Design a protein around this ligand. Structure first.
Ligand SMILES: Cc1cc2nc3c(=O)[nH]c(=O)nc-3n(C[C@H](O)[C@H](O)[C@H](O)COP(=O)(O)O)c2cc1C
Ligand code: SF4
Lengths: 229, 56
């Protein structure tokens, strides 16, 4: 876009928050903004906290704030106590989820969350306690991605519809364990081959759910095989 | 076979072997012409994953 953008003219696309904070950085200096956070993760960030929390809310906070501190301080904590936490998606639907153990001592910046194989994304924390069907939530996210794809390139279009069907079958446990790895491969055949990042943002949630809750999927399909003989 | 005893002894003596032990005419010992359905197992490259064609 810096060469051929809108109307064929040079263009630069910037988020609302970035341009909104730009004049304050100019007025108060760049060093003051760089003071907050770690190196290469400077500044303050707006965090939306939603899901299974007592008080879901939007709060502006220093960048490298721990996830547990952010939940307990502003959001009022996980409903039913911290031990009731099951999983958390820290950067909206695109970023993969992390379990309780990983999120016990994790920070919110790009580098630390990339180290946790997730990424900060847009800093949209969605929490889920132990009393929810995480497979159902991830299937709903994949269905959302299926509904919201332009469909011009075959990988995203066909593969995301395929993953939606596979995840809908997983929710009931109608598949076989050998399919799970297959799904992983399907995701790897989508990520990196599409035009935009919607394909990557649809492949990542499936990869994270598989990587962190393969036993849950296997248990559910074993139960389905047992009831249906 | 449906052969009398005397003829059987005559044949066994003339040939020098026991004919009725190993006959050359097929009888009920053969398999039936109607058989149960088979199953025919699939080959080794019927995996659902780690089965890219460029490796095999
Ligand atoms: C499918 C898709 C949807 C996106 N939606 C948004 C959005 O709604 N808001 C946003 O700020 N960025 C969104 N992005 C990220 C954009 O790439 C981003 O706005 C743009 O690259 C400029 O980002 P920046 O202002 O942080 O530099 C989306 C990216 C993808 C692939
Ligand atoms: S990956 Fe992007 S460009 Fe390709 S079909 Fe999906 S939304 Fe359209």
């Amino acid at each position: 876009p810096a060469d051929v953008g809108v109307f064929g003219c040079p263009t630069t696309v910037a988020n609302v928050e970035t341009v909104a904070v730009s004049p304050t950085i100019c007025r108060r200096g760049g060093a003051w903004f760089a003071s907050f956070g770690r190196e290469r993760n400077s500044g303050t960030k707006l965090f939306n906290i939603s899901g299974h929390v007592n008080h879901p809310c939007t709060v502006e906070e220093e960048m490298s704030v721990p996830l547990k501190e952010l939940i307990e301080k502003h959001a009022g904590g996980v409903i039913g106590g911290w031990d009731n936490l099951l999983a958390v998606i820290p950067g909206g639907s695109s970023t993969p989820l992390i379990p309780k153990s990983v999120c016990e001592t994790v920070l919110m910046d790009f580098d630390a969350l990339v180290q946790a194989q997730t990424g900060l994304g847009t800093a949209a924390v969605i929490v889920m306690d132990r009393s929810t069907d995480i497979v159902k939530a991830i299937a709903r996210l994949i269905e959302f991605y299926k509904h919201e794809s332009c469909g011009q390139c075959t990988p995203c279009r066909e593969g995301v519809d395929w993953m939606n069907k596979v995840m809908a079958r997983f929710v009931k446990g109608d598949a076989r364990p050998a399919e799970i790895d297959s799904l992983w491969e399907i995701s790897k055949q989508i990520e990196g081959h599409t035009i935009c990042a919607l394909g990557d943002g649809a492949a990542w949630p499936v990869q994270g759910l598989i990587r962190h809750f393969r036993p849950e999927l296997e248990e559910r399909m074993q139960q389905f095989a047992l009831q249906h003989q | 076979a449906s052969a009398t005893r005397v003829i059987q002894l005559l044949r066994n003596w003339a040939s020098g072997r026991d004919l009725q032990a190993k006959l050359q005419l097929r009888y009920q010992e053969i398999s039936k012409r109607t058989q149960p359905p088979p199953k025919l197992p699939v080959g080794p490259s019927h995996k659902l994953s780690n089965n890219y064609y460029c490796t095999r």
